[PDB]
């Protein structure tokens, strides 16, 4: 803990509680003054302070009662998938069973119905087919007690069987009803009046066929007809309906999402029952892609004699497919086709009558996407890369989405086991194949290896053994994992490589669900910070107990209309009086509710000081509710980045948290005191955001005097055969004489990769954009998985990063200039570099063709600079021919150094290296002289302010853009025609007022000295409490 107090963090009364008690799982001392109690529930019951811990205590008892009941009846312990479902059942929440097909899905509904029937609650189990109704009817009767009465109805039973069901239904003397989906449609009026506590639907597709069936299910759990129709009108309008809090509906469980729901009706569950009937897209696949450089029929036969069975061959056209079918029939092969007759040939393939099935590639084709048989489909062979026509000119480009679908027929999570698949591409066109690889990397992050790299014996064994494990009763190892991030953009990027299987509306936040080989994975975004320093009490929100400063935090509130943020517990916005407020208190409560359902929770906030503060705020809040809390940091939002983050899973680093607190307190104490004085003078609030802002504003103000005084005379000299020369003063001689010419050869090393400061400066200058706009683009690229983390002070490039450059250079055929460089060895982050070997031009083509659409032209131009800068650092040095020439102009000697020839191309392929016309040891006539004035000391630019902050040791990678932009927003600094920053008249007076009274507190030496100390606090070298005393002594002096 960091000895901090958080509002609404107590798990028993919802009041203020310290982080030390939250870390130990204890409530606030008002509820329980004891430090080491045996049982928290008994302690609160003893003192009669038990308010909300009762709900938690019942939850764990109910789950164990369900868990023990499951073990007694079924004889097997709850699986990982069923652990998540059981906890949602006892909380009275409707959900879609996000899981692969299996017997555990149907048996869980049977156990829940029996468990609810034991306490007297009625259940209704709905099944698609009559045969499934009978099977579950006899399975329930064997295990249920004689006191539990179960009745079913179908069209195949005798009239005596029907009559006893109808008698019981009207008598309402039943516990579990097992009827078909057709019964719902033909008896929706009678079922609407009856209310059930648990409804289980084995097949959602049957319900989706009839629009009335969806409304009937909602009425079964107690939702009134008026609410359903009004919500549907709101959904059709476009808005999101709000479920009234007085409504307590039953549990509705959808067994399997089948990606079929396309109408607008299924969205009713999202607003009325807080769960989404998902369009299950399972991005989970284990496929080895191998490319054979030739398209010879002889090599196809040799490959088919290794796989020998369960092979699909996808041809580009029907004519080519017929050609392969007859060639594979001349040679003795059990081969079929799917164009003249599909159902018979596929059935023969399924039963083993046919070993090889040939089809024609097509997007959403019946063989490409329609079939689902990973048990039989093991090897997928493409006779030519699947291609599509783009634009009116019918450009032929690879169709990666068809390739993903067709290759996906051989790999999915089957019976809880992700079976292995092999995809083989016969392609001779290198340009088509290389285009396919980049698209597959961008979309699926799957590589395609060459024929020599592949080992067919290993792949066949890997294919056979994986299906062997799916056929047998697997021991359950599945777990439910919760990933907590702060950015919605990161969550959307995660869902693209994890799968947006289903969504749950949990108070403010939306919790997504996905299926992996390890089980379910949940991920949600908190939408920014959760806690912030309070305003009133103590020293500007910081109390002082026992000689130590205890920060006091409250949940952040953001007005959705005007965007104003505040921490006070209010019903309306302080600025516009709007009640539409995004309160992080509801976000925190939702996280606590979800923490009970997940087996383990990982807080994947950004890997910096501010992200660590957010992680500990969430961690300490959820600790009283769960113990499986750990911290991971993703340096790139990709499958690889997620894997690497989990490989180095850790706990919260309190050194980083303390660094954020001292940096926040310094801004709060300096800012509020200075703003208070400035408010009395200039009538504006928040005129001082901190100490660094005033120091930078000082530089811009001082630059006016330095820019004016440095005004010197200059003359531009153009020469007969030569370069333009800048020389001081007025030049009267009409010739320039070379007195010494020195020419030699040199090797030019490239510049290091981008850091935050260097990327901001160079990109802003070249693209004519503000540093804040560039920073936001950098954040967008990182959170969308295109570059590494953009808040870094290091040039370090890992071996993986160097491999990225090598892969691109091999792709373009320029690997002879590859020069892997690690650059720095220190640093908690890599430099800003692309994560995939895809240049900007390739990315723009993908955007134009619709593969991705989340990048604008400014994003591409920023990415281009990052890509070329990084690959320049990973490219060979360029050998040049340079000359050093001494010239005499108006009797005074001047030195000129220039490159005149490039002898060996290197990194200049990515960052051009300009050459100049060669000089000779002779006299040069002057064609024309241009007379002008230039200032020796130039005006500051947004790029050069970041450079100055870096070299003067003030500012951080997380604050460089903010410091510059705040000066603009406060009205202190403006930009002229040439994008040079200058102080406004108001900005001058603000700095003048501060210099006369508070210059010592805002001078650069003080700013740098405090920055160095707070850096050591981050590294654990300076004490956290001692640093706060240093600030407290300083602010006490300036309050006089
Ligand atoms: Cl490394
Ligand atoms: Cl930082
Ligand atoms: Zn309490
Ligand atoms: Zn507002």
From Swiss-Prot:
Binding site for ATP: 82, 99-106
Thermal activity profile: Optimum temperature is 90 degrees Celsius for production of positive supercoils. Thermostable for at least 4 hours at 85 degrees Celsius. Optimum temperature is 65 degrees Celsius for ATPase activity. The necessity for high temperature for positive supercoiling is probably because reverse gyrase preferentially binds to ssDNA.
Keyword Nucleotide-binding appears in the UniProt entry: yes
The UniProt record lists the keyword Signal: no
Predominant subcellular localization, coarse grouping: cytoplasm
Gene3D superfamilies per UniProt: 2.60.510.20, 3.30.56.80, 3.40.50.140, P-loop containing nucleotide triphosphate hydrolases, Topoisomerase I, domain 2, Topoisomerase I, domain 4
Gene Ontology molecular function, alphabetical: ATP binding; ATP hydrolysis activity; DNA binding; DNA topoisomerase type II (double strand cut, ATP-hydrolyzing) activity; reverse gyrase activity; zinc ion binding
Stated role: Modifies the topological state of DNA by introducing positive supercoils in an ATP-dependent process. Increases the linking number in steps of +1. Probably recognizes regions with a low GC content which melt and form a ssDNA bubble, allowing the enzyme to bind and cleave the DNA prior to strand passage; the bubble is probably cleaved by 2 reverse gyrase molecules, one on each strand. Positively supercoils DNA with all NTPS, although it strongly prefers ATP. In the presence of non-hydrolyzable ATP analogs it partially relaxes negative supercoils.
Protein name, UniProt field: Reverse gyrase
Organism: Thermotoga maritima (strain ATCC 43589 / DSM 3109 / JCM 10099 / NBRC 100826 / MSB8)
